[PDB]
Write a protein that binds this DNA or RNA. Structure first.
Ligand SMILES: [Mg+2]
Ligand SMILES: [Mg+2]
Ligand SMILES: [Mg+2]
Ligand SMILES: [Mg+2]
Ligand SMILES: [Mg+2]
Ligand SMILES: [Mg+2]
Ligand SMILES: [Mg+2]
Ligand SMILES: [Mg+2]
Ligand SMILES: [Mg+2]
Ligand SMILES: [Mg+2]
Lengths: 74, 134, 72, 59, 53
RNA sequence: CUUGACUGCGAGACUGACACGUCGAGCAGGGAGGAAACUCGGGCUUAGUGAACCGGUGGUACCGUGUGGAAGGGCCAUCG
RNA sequence: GUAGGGGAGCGUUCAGUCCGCGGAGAAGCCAUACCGGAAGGAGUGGUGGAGCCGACUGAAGUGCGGAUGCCGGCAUGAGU
RNA sequence: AACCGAACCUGGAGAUAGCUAGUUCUCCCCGAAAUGUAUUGAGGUACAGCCUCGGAUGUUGACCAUGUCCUGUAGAGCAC
RNA sequence: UGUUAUGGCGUGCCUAUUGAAGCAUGAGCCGGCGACUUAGACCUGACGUGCGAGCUUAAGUUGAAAAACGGAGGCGGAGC
RNA sequence: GAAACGAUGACUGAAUCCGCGCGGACCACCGCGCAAGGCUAAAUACUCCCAGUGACCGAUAGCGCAUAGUACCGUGAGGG
RNA sequence: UCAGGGAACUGAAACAUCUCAGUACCUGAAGGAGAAGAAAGAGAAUUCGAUUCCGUUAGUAGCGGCGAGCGAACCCGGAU
């Protein structure tokens, strides 16, 4: 049979070198792809959200683990 | 002279004739020509399904009498029970209430039906009296 | 045609499903909504002269317990 | 329309419309506690445009 | 949240002297006799809640 | 070991035509675990669902048609 | 440049003013090589025989190729 | 009473008609849409999206370059 | 200006359409009739006018070649 | 519907002035009223008809009719 | 004008309550007019004081598959 191409959404909401706010949603993910770095929290759905205001740090280690951080802009 | 009498200069435009216009055939091609049924509201679209009750009452309502109004201008004619109609509260239908908005020190004595806290706390600190029905 | 006043003059007929309830039902709802009629009985009496005519059961009671413009 | 008065179509002082949150009202609950307090204040101004017209003259 | 003949249940809730409705989903399967928990009523909060009824 | 499968709230964002939906630092009443930093407003996440309306049920005391009460209604839960 | 929106206007009946024209002849009808960016508007010539332009303002039953549209008149099929 | 799966006439009555057909005087300025979602919805309708006029704002637009990150297609490869 | 001979060019109009010279609808021809209106102390907006933190009257009364009176009431003025 | 009150169709069927009906379930206070008997211009409605006027028509308009419900159609109602 | 009787198409984008609407039609009685009337009342001031009519209250109180929709009265201003 066939049914349901699903809407979902996902993607990475706030990209690198972008200035965010406290409360903005940075990444919408499913599992843990992007680990919350310094300045960054992770919701129960593993959504990455911002604790404080500042600039978006992307950290690439070879993946498997990589990090969304927030460093101050000021 | 009536014949030299001019127009309003831009009060009205002429009306709208849909006869002629060489390629006007009006309204919408199908569907929504000819009907008297158009009707923007209705229970169909997102009004019902909307979840409220509360309950309707709207009881006693009072004349809002600005403090700024009372003070500043006029004489302090000692408003009281009659002259007040000429003071532009004009309602009838309802009793009168006094609330605090503008600030100027004045001795004033007024008969209204009720007042707010900082209203009486205002009128007296500048000196005066505010009466209430017994 | 009765004695005092008149006859017939009738009402419509209502009937309702979800009949009863818990008095505090969900609601009562309707079905019938049709027109209806009314009538009475006739017996033989006379006044001023011998007649038969018709007798309203109320006025039957009345004529029986007293002679107000009529006798049996 | 004249039904919608006590239900919230309600109009503000800025000529906006009060429509908040329906998420679950009476039947079907037993999820969380603040979805239950999820009942809000709120609105949108898209369908507020023709909303007031239901309530129009009686503010 | 649908209901019928089935197992488990949605059982109502109350406190010692305090008046509050938790209404949580219970289950008669493994064990249900004591519905006893600790929940917080009108004012005092801080009480044991017997949801057994 | 326990009843955070909490109450009163939401800075700010994801998403949707709308209605819904989603995540969420943090303030307070307060709790539970830990020596402590601290964590907790259900569950690795993603499905396990349904607007309004009419009604059943517990709580609160606003409306209640001359006035004082009650009937009925309203609001906070909540069941269908 | 199609639905659609915006702007300027042309022409027609009625009405109030204004200016007037007409038996040495009104409107209407007929022709016409002129005028105007268009709707349109004049010039003269022929018909007519009792009335009518121009200007301003206002009001409309106000503009037709269609609707197997309506009333009428007259064609084609045919000297069949 | 010359068309009877319910006669004829007058009437309610301009029945309703998400259907079809038609909708006339000029020029000027712009200028679409047949997508998305919901719909006893599918040739219909509500909201959005795209058109126009007016106001406010006042380069935020547009392309192109530099910087910065995100993506797993083409290719490829055989490490599951 | 009228008529003409020759050359070049040249797929009625409308409607309905993804698409019409269409072998898809309509229509014999010419008159004349013929379709976005009217109403309400309604709702909302644009332009214009009078007063302006005020603004207005309705029924009705009285004069009526002519219009005045009539503040019952309505709308601003406070919100949640 | 918590449904008061008027109104009757069927069964019932009280008081009478330290009395009776009402005041929107019902109770008490507190008010308002006194049913079972009748008549009663005026201000209101309409236009067969007569008068006067009209930004009403003027011979496909205006009433159907510049007189005709006649001719003409139908058994008739009716149409015209 | 009052009275006895009383539709449906239609709206609810389907349809039973509902709306159309006590509308159309039938019938009965009467006049130039009718109807209605001299509070067992409105009404919440211990005000008003027969009926009808206009304004207004007011789309307000309220009615309702609380859907489509329907929609008062007192006060107050009058004609009388
Ligand atoms: Mg068409
Ligand atoms: Mg021959
Ligand atoms: Mg032949
Ligand atoms: Mg032959
Ligand atoms: Mg036959
Ligand atoms: Mg028709
Ligand atoms: Mg055409
Ligand atoms: Mg097209
Ligand atoms: Mg053809
Ligand atoms: Mg051909």
């Amino acid at each position: 049979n066939g049914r349901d191409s699903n809407p979902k959404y996902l993607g990475v909401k706030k990209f690198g070198g972008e200035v965010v706010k406290a409360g903005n949603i940075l990444v919408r993910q499913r599992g843990t792809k992007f680990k919350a770095g310094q300045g960054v929290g992770m919701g129960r759905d593993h959504t990455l959200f911002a604790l404080s205001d500042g600039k978006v740090v992307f950290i690439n280690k070879g993946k498997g683990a990589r990090f969304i951080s927030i460093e101050a802009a000021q | 002279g009536s014949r030299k009498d001019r127009k309003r200069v831009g009060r009205g435009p002429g009306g709208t004739d849909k006869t002629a216009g060489r390629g006007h055939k009006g309204q919408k091609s199908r569907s929504g020509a000819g009907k008297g049924a158009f009707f923007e509201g209705g229970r169909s679209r997102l009004i019902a399904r909307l979840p409220k009750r509360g309950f309707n009452n709207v009881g006693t309502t009072y004349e809002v009498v600005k403090l700024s109004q009372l003070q500043d201008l006029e004489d302090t004619t000692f408003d009281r029970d009659t002259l007040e109609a000429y003071r532009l509260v004009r309602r009838k239908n309802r009793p009168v209430k006094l609330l605090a908005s503008g600030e100027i020190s004045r001795a004033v004595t007024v008969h209204v039906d009720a007042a707010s806290a900082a209203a009486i706390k205002a009128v007296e600190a500048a000196g005066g009296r505010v009466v209430l029905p017994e | 045609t009765g004695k005092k006043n008149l006859v017939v003059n009738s009402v419509i007929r209502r009937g309702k499903a979800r009949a009863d309830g818990g008095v505090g039902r969900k609601t009562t709802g309707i079905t019938k909504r049709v027109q209806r009629a009314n009538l009475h009985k006739k017996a033989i009496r006379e006044n001023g002269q011998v007649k038969t005519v018709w007798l309203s059961a109320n006025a039957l009671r009345t004529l029986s317990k007293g002679p107000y413009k009529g006798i049996e | 329309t004249h039904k919608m008065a006590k239900r919230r179509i309600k109009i503000t002082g800025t000529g906006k419309v009060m429509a908040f949150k329906s998420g679950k009202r009476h039947q079907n609950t037993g999820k969380s506690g603040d979805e239950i307090r999820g009942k809000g204040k709120g609105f949108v101004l898209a369908k507020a445009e023709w909303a007031r017209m239901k309530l129009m003259l009686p503010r | 949240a649908k209901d019928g003949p089935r197992i488990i249940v949605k059982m109502e809730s109350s406190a010692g002297t305090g008046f509050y409705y938790t209404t949580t989903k219970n289950r008669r399967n493994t064990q249900a006799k004591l519905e006893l928990k600790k929940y917080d009523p009108v004012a005092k909060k801080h009480v044991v809640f017997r949801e057994k009824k």
